[PDB]
Amino acid sequence: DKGRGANKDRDGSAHPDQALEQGSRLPARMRNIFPAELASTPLEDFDPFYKNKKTFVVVTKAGDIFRFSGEKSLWMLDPFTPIRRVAISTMVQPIFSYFIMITILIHCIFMIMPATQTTYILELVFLSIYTIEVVVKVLARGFILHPFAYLRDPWNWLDFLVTLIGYITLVVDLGHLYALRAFRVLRSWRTVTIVPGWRTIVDALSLSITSLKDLVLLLLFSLFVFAVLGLQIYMGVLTQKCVKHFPADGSWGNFTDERWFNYTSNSSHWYIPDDWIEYPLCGNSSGAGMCPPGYTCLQGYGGNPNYGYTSFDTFGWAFLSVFRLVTLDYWEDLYQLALRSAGPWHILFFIIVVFYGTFCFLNFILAVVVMSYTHMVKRADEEKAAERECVPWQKLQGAIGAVVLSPFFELFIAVIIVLNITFMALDHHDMNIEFERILRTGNYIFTSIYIVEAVLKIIALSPKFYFKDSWNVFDFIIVVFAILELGLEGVQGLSVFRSFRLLRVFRLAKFWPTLNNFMSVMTKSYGAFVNVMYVMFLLLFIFAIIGMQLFGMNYIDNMERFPDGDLPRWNFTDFLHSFMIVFRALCGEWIESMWDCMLVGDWSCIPFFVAVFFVGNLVILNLLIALLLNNYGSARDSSVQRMWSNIRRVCFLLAKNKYFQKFVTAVLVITSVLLALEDIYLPQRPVLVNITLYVDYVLTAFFVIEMIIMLFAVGFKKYFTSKWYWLDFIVVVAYLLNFVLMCAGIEALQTLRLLRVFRLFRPLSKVNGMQVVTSTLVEAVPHIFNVILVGIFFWLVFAIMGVQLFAGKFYKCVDENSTVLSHEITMDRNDCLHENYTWENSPMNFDHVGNAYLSLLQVATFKGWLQIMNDAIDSREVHKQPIRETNIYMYLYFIFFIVFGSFFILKLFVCILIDIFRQQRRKAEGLSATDSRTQLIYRRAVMRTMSAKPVKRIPKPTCHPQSLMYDISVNRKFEYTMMILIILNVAVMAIDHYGQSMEFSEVLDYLNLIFIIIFFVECVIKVSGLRHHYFKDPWNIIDFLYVVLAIAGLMLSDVIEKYFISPTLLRILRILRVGRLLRYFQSARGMRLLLLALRKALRTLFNVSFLLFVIMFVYAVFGMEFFMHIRDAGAIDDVYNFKTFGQSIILLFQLATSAGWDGVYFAIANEEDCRAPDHELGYPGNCGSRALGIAYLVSYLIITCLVVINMYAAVILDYVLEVYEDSKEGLTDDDYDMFFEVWQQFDPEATQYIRYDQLSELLEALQPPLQVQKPNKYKILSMNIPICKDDHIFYKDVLEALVKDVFSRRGSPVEAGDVQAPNVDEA
Amino acid sequence: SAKDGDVEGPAGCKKYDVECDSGECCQKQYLWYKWRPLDCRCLKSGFFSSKCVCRDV
Ligand SMILES: *[C@@H]1O[C@H](CO)[C@@H](O[C@@H]2O[C@H](CO)[C@@H](O)[C@H](O)[C@H]2NC(C)=O)[C@H](O)[C@H]1NC(C)=O
Ligand SMILES: *[C@@H]1O[C@H](CO)[C@@H](O[C@@H]2O[C@H](CO)[C@@H](O)[C@H](O)[C@H]2NC(C)=O)[C@H](O)[C@H]1NC(C)=O
Ligand SMILES: *[C@@H]1O[C@H](CO)[C@@H](O)[C@H](O)[C@H]1NC(C)=O
Ligand SMILES: *[C@@H]1O[C@H](CO)[C@@H](O)[C@H](O)[C@H]1NC(C)=O
Ligand SMILES: *[C@@H]1O[C@H](CO)[C@@H](O)[C@H](O)[C@H]1NC(C)=O
Ligand code: NA
Prior knowledge:
The complex is a heterodimer.
Chain A: H1 7-14, H2 52-59, H3 84-91, H4 96-112, H5 117-136, H6 154-170, H7 198-211, H8 213-233, E1 241-244, H9 259-265, E2 295-298, H10 305-308, H11 315-327, H12 331-342, H13 347-388, H14 393-404, H15 409-425, E3 431-432, H16 435-458, H17 463-466, H18 470-487, H19 508-511, H20 513-524, H21 527-550, H22 554-557, H23 575-586, H24 591-599, H25 605-623, H26 625-628, H27 638-655, H28 658-673, H29 686-719, H30 723-743, H31 750-753, H32 761-764, H33 770-779, H34 781-806, E4 811-814, H35 829-834, E5 838-841, H36 849-860, H37 865-874, H38 891-902, H39 907-924, H40 935-943, H41 964-967, H42 972-987, H43 1000-1025, H44 1034-1050, H45 1063-1071, H46 1085-1123, H47 1141-1150, H48 1157-1164, H49 1186-1204, H50 1206-1224, H51 1229-1239, E6 1249-1251, H52 1253-1261, H53 1273-1279, E7 1288-1290, H54 1291-1306, H55 1311-1321
Chain B: E1 7-8, E2 28-30, E3 35-36, E4 38-44, E5 50-56
Antiparallel strand pairs in B: 1-2, 2-3, 4-5
The complex binds a molecule of 2 linked components (NAG-NAG) (2 copies), 2-acetamido-2-deoxy-beta-D-glucopyranose (3 copies) and sodium ion (NA).
PDB class: membrane protein/toxin
Keywords: complex, sodium channel, toxin, membrane protein, MEMBRANE PROTEIN-TOXIN complex
Assembly: dimeric
């Protein structure tokens, strides 16, 4: 409307074009001062040659009017065909922009190769070709001086500055920088314009970054609050070590003086166990680190962990640690480095920062990326839709075709393909001689059957109808390659040709239709995935060349800083290593790489790894979820009848009461906390053993008396047909079976006593908002079962591939201390076992496809994969020693699995729960499923009118000082002044650092004395002026709690305080008071729209987390019964284990975000060098179970991390769409709050009526979208606003007639009539 | 006794890392400072290929 309003306007009046180009259009017009034969819209082809094809360009302007025309410059130079005409014809050639594009692709190749003598001589050539190209386009346009010049287009600001940087580097200019040379790769961003359909992904990427402006300011605010909060309670805490006591003898003299400090600062006196790199932390709290005997936990000696980079000691390092906790990478280290030194009750710091950081604010990022991509696909689809609108030979063929066409020969090939997939999965390492023969002689039978069915197919159908369909031409490639595996059975080079047996797995895609439907979506919209995947690897290419030119020579020069003095496996030293340290940070794992870029370099790694994590993970991996969302989203019987029916009369009345149902729920909750109290201490608690024994007798009679009552109430037909009563009946059987065995000598099975925690789920679903949460998980379980089966299929292809690449190759020679001998000592198993060493295998391997399934789970979650990829790169042959970094191109196997198995299969879980939740939340609000998204906007704006009530002004008191106490307690000057003081009170807490001084500590101690005096007057004014309405706002309580506990700290020194009035609780009430800011920004429309969608989601986000804790409760009581007696390995130790319930909850919370499941698996599945249990002596055995550890962890990871964490993303996504649909078209909830905020200043008493002369005053005081400015009177004259018989009008009549105004001015087509029809139905 | 290469079993049989056809592999072998019992196994070598040689249990 506006941009095409200046289409012919400035091209008619300001300056016309000098040419045009759309489909081989090579004219050169002018600005009508000396023009030459442009057009008169006659679409003629008479005079010239380029004017002849201009009719074909205008015939292309009849179906494709505005897509390709090249708008030339203004004239602005008086160039009436000089040599500038040569440049305007050179510039528009299709071979000119094919030529510069090829030199970019060649100059990218000479960046992955190492630099040599000829590398410098091509930089002379490429800078020459890129500078003719900047001279042509400026000798064919302007510079910036007129419109439509060279520097007016954003692609020309790229290829100009990058040419100017190449001038300063190549020819000697300024000599000294050399860091700008890394930025020469940015010219290869314009190679995105080579793949068809590029503008939809590049515009959705630019629309995302523009729309993430008001989220970053809200994330940077909340990261500021959590990093002051973590600064105040964790300062100096990560330095706590175990220090040995000062002796009563010895090399240090006996006098206890500052020789204590000499002895204590000595590093040889800090406890470290043997062959460990870092010192173990410890604390004095209850379930903390627990220093060995002869030691004491002390602060202030040595450094913080992770080369000193993990700390809360300054505001800088606290901001980085709070940011890696919002991100979620390696957070289980910081979580375990903080609860070991501070104690287990500090899980509450980590629950809040994970709930508000990564479960809320990182799903607002996903919701913005999805809306930006959906807005571009919606534009592109409607723009394309406008563009679219012999006698025996014939005898046997009727007989051969009689069996082939029928669906019985099609069944027999389906059985053999399933049987062929089974024989490829049974191949493994170390097979015996007869079982390996079955797999060879079955290969000969499968091959000849595929040959017979491919020669009975061309005879039956036709030789020209066989090549018709695409499944017969894929079946024909299989029988060609199977001949090559048998013709080249033993000649040479047959490793390549037997790899193409894996393509027979994809022949299952024709028969069963769940996988067939999944393949059709990949072939329908494929180029949308090609654009996202090419933009993904091109950004990775740019961060990889930038990385090795900036951080590359630090790894070689300062190599001595690394702990052994050698390079890590992950560095920036060449191209493939730089591509993998950057691909790793795409996947969400950036901080261990940032730790040693910064150990060896400087501060410049901190903007690098944040920017490659931001663009790569939070935008590009979410733009791939928005792509799967738009493509995969779719006697005398009547004498006993009177007695048996009075039994069912009593029981049915009793089963429906409120008090009977609350009594049953109270028994189930209390007895389930009894179940969390059997732990490793329950033997030696003899009174608790008897209570546990008697509750099992009450419940085995309570479960029977209740079952009989529920069986008279609901009957046999409706009891045994419901899934809640098959849950109850299994617990009744499992407690009668325990009562039977206990009488008959046998001790009762402990795994059947724990079954009564499942009876906890039925009253959990009765909580206020739990019905949308649990109905989605029941509707989604047939959908996510089909994503398991399809994902088990695609991981079978990479399991049988990875067994054939790596089986038997993860063996290595191993010394006494489990360290790996290098080669030149032992090169094979002969040399290893000749010198009594051990030839061990890795615990995570590809030996059979059962082990391979478990290694691919571990690289898909990115938890354990660093060790698996090291074994594969080192592996060379079967009985040979692995050499470091030798099979380095096996990284490409893992890139294509992570792309197709983790970025694609696991995101279909997020896709399902988003689609199920929208339609269940619609079902819970009574809305109809067949209402297409516009009629629900108008229905939502009318239901808020019927529920609207004007609020009453707080009564102003009339006392002697209390008039002014109301005057100043209400003005915006005083309520903004006291908000600036809260911001300054807390920004002064940010300059607190560890070990500051006694005088820096006293300046700030005096400033806190001034603010508490100021905050005491501001408390006494707002309590005087607002006498009991002061306590109605929840931020006035936290103001009032803080001032009371701060005055009572400054006095009352002779208290018996033992953390009684502790300063840690005062520091939290200083900072929690900042959140008054969240209700003061409303002029920021983009934030107020995003805090509104959060506030409406808080109820059902609390219900996802309370479902989460019950799933953690059930598995903690099961994990204590399984893994309480387990030897320490990997992650299980004296602090983090399954011994008690609270210690189990520390583990299952960490493990809910999948963090560290590989090292938890290593302990609870350990079946080697342990001790068998000894029942009749009193010993339980320290053995794990492999089968029970897999069925416990794979169970928790898919139940809690793949579906219930993904429920947070579904709920956020649903409300951000509804709130932004309100701000654009309908009316937000905060717009009805501002009507009654203006309404109460025209009736303070809420007399619910205003004077008629007050209404033209009213509409001037409203702010848009409801306002009507001057002259509003004649629009009031059209709203018609029915008046009562006092010239006073009702509030709803004003509010109803203003909703109809917003919908009429904004939408023409169906907006007024559908809004007025819904208001008649609701009244 | 216990020479660094020794076999038990019938006269003429396959020693360690020598290709076996499903029998004909020696009863016992003295390698690495013990008597190990030998067996015929098929170990992985290439895509869907395995050479079958005498290897200890
Ligand atoms: C843990 O508790 C011990 C003992 O209460 C504390 O040790 C004292 O530390 C001070 C230095 O701050 C020494 O001068 C004392 O001699 C130590 N006392 C004893 C009995 O050894 C230790 O500071 C506490 N650690 C904390 C709070 O992190
Ligand atoms: C360790 O290897 C050595 C040779 O590398 C083996 O050699 C024996 O060593 C013992 C002493 O420990 C001598 O008494 C024997 O004479 C050596 N030879 C033989 C054939 O046994 C030794 O067997 C290996 N260690 C063990 C425990 O077996
Ligand atoms: C630590 O203690 C040892 C004890 O002999 C002493 O020799 C050494 O100088 C001390 N200091 C350091 C930094 O090792
Ligand atoms: C005290 O210990 C430090 C290191 O812990 C050492 O450098 C210093 O020499 C010691 N002081 C003496 C031995 O007087
Ligand atoms: C194992 O113990 C120490 C620590 O690594 C080392 O000095 C020793 O050489 C190792 N190897 C042995 C005892 O074979
Ligand atoms: Na990391």
